[PDB]
Amino acid sequence: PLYETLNESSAVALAVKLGLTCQEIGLNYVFHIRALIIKQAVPPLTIDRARIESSALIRQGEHVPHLVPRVFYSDTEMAVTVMEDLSHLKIARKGLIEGENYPHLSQHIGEFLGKTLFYSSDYALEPKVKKQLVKQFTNPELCDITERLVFTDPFFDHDTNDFEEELRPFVEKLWNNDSVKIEAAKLKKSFLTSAETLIHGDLHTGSIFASEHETKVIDPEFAFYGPIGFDVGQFIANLFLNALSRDGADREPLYEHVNQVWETFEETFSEAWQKDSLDVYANIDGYLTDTLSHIFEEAIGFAGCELIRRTIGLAHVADLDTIVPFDKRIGRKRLALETGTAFIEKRSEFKTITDVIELFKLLVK
Amino acid sequence: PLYETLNESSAVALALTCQEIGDGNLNYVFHIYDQEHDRALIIKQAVPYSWPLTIDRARIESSALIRQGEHVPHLVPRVFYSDTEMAVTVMEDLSHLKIARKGLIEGENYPHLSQHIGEFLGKTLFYSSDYALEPKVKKQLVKQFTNPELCDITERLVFTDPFFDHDTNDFEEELRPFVEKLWNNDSVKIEAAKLKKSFLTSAETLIHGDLHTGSIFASEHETKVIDPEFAFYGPIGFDVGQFIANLFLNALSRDGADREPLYEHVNQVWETFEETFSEAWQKDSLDVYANIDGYLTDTLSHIFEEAIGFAGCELIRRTIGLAHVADLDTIVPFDKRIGRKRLALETGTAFIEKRSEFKTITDVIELFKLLVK
């Protein structure tokens, strides 16, 4: 077997053996070594995610090379990906909580979303080509994490949930809500079955490096063929999660980001569709429009699952957990549950991104 | 390479007397009949040398038949042996039965056809879905049953070509005015496109993929579903819609009160499907959501809507596309044939456009009846 777990010394040796000072800065080792990053999966989760991540980064790079790190080398057996150093940037979630507003974040992520999502779909690819990519990017273990954490466990009294006792009354309201859970189920069924395009699968503010002028999407290890709306919904939900961690007028930049990411996505996806669709149906008046309306509806539903899941599930976000004082934290966490719920149940009622934003604003006053 | 094309002698050596009896031209079917006992056997083999198609479909077909046999062994031929590289499937002889399409055109009513097909549909469709399987297991089955070439046939012929002026279409000049009407109908074509997009993307369960009346052997008391070579992970409503559409295609070839058994079959197949799917759901779902009141109901409404849309595609596709059905082509006289073919286009279009408005299977039957008066 070719697999050996790396150390600072074997990492530098490998960088040299490929012709391209070391500190481990990381389930994953990250070796920072001009500069370079050598990422390695450690063996509970398969090391195959490293193959997915590298391949997904490379596919993303054909369309948006400026929005993802460049990959210099990958090895499936060693579960290694050698890539661009982005140390000089900050994780978007961390920056946002510190009060950075990143003026271009939404334009950049909108463009990422519109191009990555269009160009790996049946709209852009011969069906026989896409069917082979579905096989290639099948990702059963990482999908399992999402299927459980985003779509199932928050909605029942399951072991993996993690929430304050003061939140219990509002958590049990959700658990006892048949109609929202039926909707969560439909959304999970779409996640399980709708192999529409190659998605990132975990596009939150913690999977983005940012400065004032730059944006880079990282860690596409959850990538697989899933619904187009999913990456869009998770990103939007994480902007709303940051809004909830802020007060008053300080929220406005995040609402502007929600608006702008949808707008840029819709326009980027639309330009790509007009220019590069292989589909004889693509040019029929109203088909692109109805396609977008369905992406929009799903995205809002997936945003609501992400709002709820991050509040009471196993994997929390720092936006909510670091809110002080404690009583303010409980209140804002109740609102994340309630807005997430409204998003899920009302997803088909919204006509524009502005309606989504205005409903959110109303609820969180 | 192990592949060698069989002949009558080769086939007996592998497995008395042997006759090649293949219906199409893409497959050999060797019937082997013995006289120690009056026992018999079928050796099917894919021929490479027609739509150009690889011989891999033989692997899909045998695998699909074996999977179906786990849940409905009484509704599919038994498989005794299969070989991927030889593209061979050795299976149960069903020569004593009649192709259902042929029998229906002859005026056979097959009282149990819909009961049996409904059960086939409910069990095959449920037990290969995420409702019944661990998602990690189902995901490996999606890979195993990936069927790009046969899917491409359907994507073109069912979902695309009839709706534009494409070279695969085949229709009488008398039909042209009504055909051009369809091509110019933006709103129905947008709906066909959505249905196609579900076909391309909704990997919900292992489907048969070509479940028409020509893919069924029948007698008064027996029904067997054959030729699952188009099988892949696709939308649950697809097999349901194709079958139903082919019942309606037969009703169109009939006159007056003779149509009633076919209408009863449409009613019964939906009802048995829904019942069967529902019983399987109750007893064998792995999903924590499965018993929340209204979830099975909404899931069925979606299956139903898609089924009716796919039925409409099939109604249109069989009328003006590359692959016709004997129900309509053998209608006499010629003027009556043109009239009934116009109606298949019209009912197919209505099904597609109105699919979300129907509440029950009887709504669909009653609309069809009105349109075909």
Q: Which helix (H) or strand (E) holds A306?
A: helix A287-312
From CA B318, how far away is CA B248, in angstroms rounded? 12
Residue of A nearest to B295 (CA): A182
Of B138, B197, B295, the CB nearest to A182: B295
Of B130, B138, B151, the CB nearest to A189: B130
Of B152, B186, B299, the CB nearest to A285: B186
Of A131, A144, A281, the CB nearest to B135: A144
Across chain A, which distance is largest between two alpha carbons, in Å? 60
Report chain A's C-alpha Rg in angstroms. Answer: 20
Nearest to A298 by CA among A226, A364, A358: A226
Distance from first CA to last CA of chain A, Å, rounded?
A: 58
Burial class (CB in 10 A: 0-12, 13-18, 19+), B273: buried
3-state DSSP of chain B: CCCCCCCHHHHHHHCCEEEECCCCCCEEEEEEECCCCCCEEEEEEECCCCCCCCCCHHHHHHHHHHHHHHHCHHHCCCEEEEECCCCEEEECCCCCCEEHHHHHHCCCCCCCHHHHHHHHHHHHHHHCCCCCCCHHHHHHHHHHCCCHHHHHHHHHHCCCHHHCCCCCCCCCHHHHHHHHHHHCCHHHHHHHHHHHHHHHHECCEEECCCCCHHHEEECCCCEEECCHHHCEEECCHHHHHHHHHHHHHHHHHCCHHHHHHHHHHHHHHHHHHHHHHHHHHHHHCCCCCCCCCCHHHHHHHHHHHHHHHHHHHHHHHHHHCCCCCHHHHCCCCHHHHHHHHHHHHHHHHHHHHHCCCCCCHHHHHHHHHHHCC
Neighbours of B31 (CB within 10 A): 18
Nearest to A134 by CA among A8, A64, A223: A223
Long-range CB pairs of A248-255, under 8 A, 24+ apart, other chains included: A250/A99, A253/A101, A254/A96, A255/A357, A255/A360, A255/A361
From CA A196, how far away is CA A221, in angstroms rounded? 18
Which CATH superfamily does the domain covering A1-88 fall into?
Phosphorylase Kinase; domain 1 (3.30.200.20)
The residue written with tokens 């273990």 in the block is A141
Q: At what angle do helices B113-127 and B237-253 cross, to 10 degrees?
A: 160
The residue written with tokens 């110019």 in the block is B184
Nearest to A270 by CA among A298, A290, A300, A297: A290
Of B146, B189, B292, the CB nearest to A284: B189
Q: Do B292 and A132 touch (CB under 8 A)?
A: no
The residue written with tokens 């074509």 in the block is B189
From CA A118, how far away is CA A123, in angstroms rounded? 7
| Cβ-Cβ contacts under 8 Å, A191 against chain B | none
Whether A131 and B146 have beta carbons less than 8 Å apart is answered as yes
Whether A304 and A272 have beta carbons less than 8 Å apart is answered as no
At a CB cut-off of 8 Å and minimum separation 6, what does B359 contact? none
Give backbone dihedrals phi and psi of A200, rounded to 5 degrees, phi first: -70, -40
What architecture is domain B97-373?
Alpha-Beta Complex (3.90)
DSSP class of A152: T
Cα-based angle A290, A293, A296 (whole degrees, multiple of 5): 155
**Minimal Cα–Cα distance from B54 to chain A, Å?**
14
| Cβ-Cβ contacts under 8 Å, B194 against chain A | 290
Nearest to B87 by CA among B120, B124, B113, B48: B48
Q: Do A188 and B289 touch (CB under 8 A)?
A: yes
Burial class (CB in 10 A: 0-12, 13-18, 19+), A143: buried
At a CB cut-off of 8 Å and minimum separation 6, what does A184 contact? A151, A155, A305, A344, B289
**Could you tell me the two tokens for A116?**
């990555």
Burial class (CB in 10 A: 0-12, 13-18, 19+), A25: exposed
- Alpha-carbon dihedral A174, A179, A185, A188, rounded to 10 degrees: -70
Whether B182 and B175 have beta carbons less than 8 Å apart is answered as no
Q: Pick the residue of A125, A131, A135, A191 with the most B CBs within 10 A to test the interface with B by mutation.
A: A131
From CA B304, how far away is CA B112, in angstroms rounded? 22
Long-range CB pairs of B300-305, under 8 A, 24+ apart, other chains included: B300/B274, B302/B237, B303/B236, B303/B237, B303/B240, B303/B277, B304/B237, B304/B270, B304/B358, B304/B361, B305/B237, B305/B355, B305/B356, B305/B358
From CA B204, how far away is CA B139, in angstroms rounded? 10
Q: Do A290 and B152 touch (CB under 8 A)?
A: no
From CA A237, how far away is CA A310, in angstroms rounded? 10
From CA B55, how far away is CA B66, in angstroms rounded? 18
Q: Do A284 and B130 touch (CB under 8 A)?
A: no
**Could you tell me the two tokens for B135?**
């998602």
**Could you tell me the two tokens for B115?**
């009961």
What residues pair up with A215 in beta bridges, in sequence order? A210
Dihedral sign, CA of B261, B262, B267, B272? positive
Whether B55 and B28 have beta carbons less than 8 Å apart is answered as no
**Could you tell me the two tokens for B46?**
């894919």
From CA A318, how far away is CA A93, in angstroms rounded? 8
What architecture is domain B1-96?
2-Layer Sandwich (3.30)
Whether A53 and A75 have beta carbons less than 8 Å apart is answered as no
Whether B354 and B367 have beta carbons less than 8 Å apart is answered as yes
**Could you tell me the two tokens for A58?**
């490379």
Whether B205 and B125 have beta carbons less than 8 Å apart is answered as yes
CATH number for the domain whose boundaries are A89-365: 3.90.1200.10
**Minimal Cα–Cα distance from B238 to chain A, Å?**
15
The residue written with tokens 């082509």 in the block is B329
**Minimal Cα–Cα distance from A297 to chain B, Å?**
15
Cα-based angle B273, B274, B277 (whole degrees, multiple of 5): 80
**Minimal Cα–Cα distance from A103 to chain B, Å?**
36
If you write DSSP's letter for every residue of A223-287 in order, what string do you get?
Answer: -EEE-THHHHHHHHHHHHHHHHHS-GGGGHHHHHHHHHHHHHHHHHHHHHHHHH---TTTTSTTH
**Could you tell me the two tokens for A240?**
């709303």
Give backbone dihedrals phi and psi of B70, rounded to 5 degrees, phi first: -65, -35
From CA B159, how far away is CA B194, in angstroms rounded? 10
Which runs of E-coded beta strand occur in chain A?
A: 23-24, 28-32, 37-41, 71-75, 80-83, 90-91, 197-199, 208-210, 215-217, 224-226
Give the residue extent of every domain in chain A: 1-88, 89-365
From CA B200, how far away is CA B182, in angstroms rounded? 22
A363 three-class SS: helix
Inter-CA distances, A241 with A130, A146, A220, A254, A320, Å: 34, 18, 21, 9, 7
The residue written with tokens 């759901």 in the block is B281
From CA B271, how far away is CA B260, in angstroms rounded? 16
At a CB cut-off of 8 Å and minimum separation 6, what does B74 contact? none
By DSSP bridging, strand B223-225 and strand B205-207 are unpaired
Whether A199 and A266 have beta carbons less than 8 Å apart is answered as no
Neighbours of B322 (CB within 10 A): 17
Whether B92 and B74 have beta carbons less than 8 Å apart is answered as no
Nearest to A199 by CA among A118, A279, A267, A106: A118
Nearest to A299 by CA among A240, A223, A364, A365: A240
Residue of B nearest to A153 (CA): B288
| Cβ-Cβ contacts under 8 Å, B294 against chain A | 178-179, 182
**Minimal Cα–Cα distance from B162 to chain A, Å?**
12
Nearest to A258 by CA among A244, A276, A277, A271: A244
CA B31 to centroid of chain Cα atoms: 24
Distance from first CA to last CA of chain B, Å, rounded?
A: 58
